[PDB]
Amino acid sequence: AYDDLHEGYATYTGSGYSGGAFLLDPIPSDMEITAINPADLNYGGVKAALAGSYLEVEGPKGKTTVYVTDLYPEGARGALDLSPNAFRKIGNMKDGKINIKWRVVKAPITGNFTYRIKEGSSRWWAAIQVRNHKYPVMKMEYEKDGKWINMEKMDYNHFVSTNLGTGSLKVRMTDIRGKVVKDTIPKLPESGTSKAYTVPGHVQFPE
Amino acid sequence: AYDDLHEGYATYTGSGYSGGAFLLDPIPSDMEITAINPADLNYGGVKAALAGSYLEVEGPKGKTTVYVTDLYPEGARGALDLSPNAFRKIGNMKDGKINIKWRVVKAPITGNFTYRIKEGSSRWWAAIQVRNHKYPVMKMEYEKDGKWINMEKMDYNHFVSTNLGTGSLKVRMTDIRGKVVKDTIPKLPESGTSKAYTVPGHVQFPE
Ligand SMILES: OC[C@H]1O[C@@H](O[C@H]2[C@H](O)[C@@H](O)[C@H](O[C@H]3[C@H](O)[C@@H](O)[C@H](O[C@H]4[C@H](O)[C@@H](O)[C@H](O)O[C@@H]4CO)O[C@@H]3CO)O[C@@H]2CO)[C@H](O)[C@@H](O)[C@@H]1O
Numbered sequence: 001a002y003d004d005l006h007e008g009y010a011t012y013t014g015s016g017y018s019g020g021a022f023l024l025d026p027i028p029s030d031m032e033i034t035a036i037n038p039a040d041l042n043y044g045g046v047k048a049a050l051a052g053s054y055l056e057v058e059g060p061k062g063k064t065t066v067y068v069t070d071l072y073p074e075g076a077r078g079a080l081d082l083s084p085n086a087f088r089k090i091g092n093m094k095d096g097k098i099n100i101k102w103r104v105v106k107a108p109i110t111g112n113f114t115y116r117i118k119e120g121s122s123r124w125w126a127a128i129q130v131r132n133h134k135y136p137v138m139k140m141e142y143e144k145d146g147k148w149i150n151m152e153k154m155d156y157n158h159f160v161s162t163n164l165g166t167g168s169l170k171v172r173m174t175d176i177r178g179k180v181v182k183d184t185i186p187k188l189p190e191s192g193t194s195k196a197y198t199v200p201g202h203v204q205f206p207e
Numbered sequence: 208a209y210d211d212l213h214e215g216y217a218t219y220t221g222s223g224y225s226g227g228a229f230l231l232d233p234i235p236s237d238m239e240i241t242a243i244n245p246a247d248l249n250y251g252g253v254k255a256a257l258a259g260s261y262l263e264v265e266g267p268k269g270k271t272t273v274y275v276t277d278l279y280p281e282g283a284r285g286a287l288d289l290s291p292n293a294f295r296k297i298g299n300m301k302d303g304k305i306n307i308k309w310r311v312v313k314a315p316i317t318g319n320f321t322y323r324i325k326e327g328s329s330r331w332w333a334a335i336q337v338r339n340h341k342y343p344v345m346k347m348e349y350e351k352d353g354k355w356i357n358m359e360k361m362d363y364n365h366f367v368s369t370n371l372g373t374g375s376l377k378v379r380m381t382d383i384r385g386k387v388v389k390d391t392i393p394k395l396p397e398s399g400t401s402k403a404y405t406v407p408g409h410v411q412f413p414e
Contacts, residue, residue, distance in 0.1 A: 120331070192326075
């Protein structure tokens with residue numbers, strides 16, 4: 001995050017803008033993105049640890065920054081699958097593969113987290129995704145009865161729990177650096193949400 | 208051995224015609240029903256094992272048959288909480304509690320199972336209830352990729368699984384006698400269904 005380094009290879013793909021595994025839609029068509037190998041994605045034993053992170057990637061021709069929107073299933077350790085507009089900046093498009101170096105960097109964003117409540121969520125079971133986060137989200141907990149409960153991060157880039165209780169939810173997020181922030185999310189319905197929805201958050205990870 | 212009676216105590220109550228734990232509503236008011244204590248309800252480590260079963264109950268003044276619609280949360284082992292139209296037939300209501308002996312009997316019904324697919328159910332997660340069954344439903348399994356998958360019975364008298372797959376769902380049910388029957392339910396919804404729905408079945412337990 002502050003400092004980090006990875007060696008590997010990039011190729012390029014047209015997928016990941018819609019229907020990517022991390023459910024980060026919609027992604028603007030001009031956005032520089034990448035899919036990420038499973039080993040590096042699940043950093044620290046957390047599924048989709050690096051989902052929605054940003055990477056600076058260096059190729060033979062220069063450097064660029066990409067947003068991580070999708071899983072790269074066949075990728076070895078260190079391997080990335082870039083969007084054409086990113087690959088173009090750091091490599092020769094006449095090559096189908098290039099040597100790269102990359103690192104998690106701070107998100108080029110502004111403002112606070114946004115939360116996405118997956119359809120089917122309720123007090124009984126909920127999947128909560130964090131968006132617009134400056135650094136990878138390693139951990140998400142919510143308070144219930146004076147105790148802090150850990151949520152499992154899923155392959156689809158949402159933190160899940162059961163019996164979260166009623167009322168608004170106090171949550172806290174931990175980034176890849178170990179930085180902790182806290183926030184409150186509106187209450188979950190008694191019955192599974194007919195549709196997914198976003199809710200504005202009020203914190204951000206530190207610079 | 209064969210078909211033992213269970214000794215216990217009965218009380219009476221007007222609840223269970225509506226809002227019963229087993230979600231068997233609506234129950235017509237002329238029906239003889241009972242709530243049942245949790246130990247006897249959860250026969251075989253299976254939650255709501257006796258839900259929607261029928262019991263013959265003998266009290267000091269006679270015998271009658273009742274439909275099990277609800278849980279008797281505070282009930283001791285052996286205990287039943289009957290509807291008063293049932294209770295009156297076997298005991299004197301001026302006494303609050305009576306000595307009984309009871310046993311599961313074949314349901315006085317006809318026709319096939321009727322399935323109820325709980326609101327919220329999809330191919331991702333489904334809760335499927337069996338109604339109109341001649342004997343307690345101890346087991347429900349569905350087929351996927353040529354394998355049979357056990358579905359956990361819940362306190363609310365539905366069998367539950369996840370990732371049930373696509374296409375029509377081949378299911379099999381097992382009763383308290385060990386009898387197995389097989390049926391087919393049409394494909395589950397693409398995503399969470401906002402209302403519970405009904406699927407008339409095409410099989411019944413033998414007898
Ligand atoms: O038991 C008490 C209580 O429970 C209620 O039923 C709950 C279940 O307890 C709960 O586990 C169930 O959770 C489902 C959920 O409905 C689905 O929406 C969700 O589907 C996910 C899927 O898991 C993902 O992999 C996929 O990618 O996305 C979808 C969603 O977008 O999966 C979970 C898995 O269990 O939800 C039920 C609530 O409707 C009963 O209704 C209630 O009567 C009981 O009192």
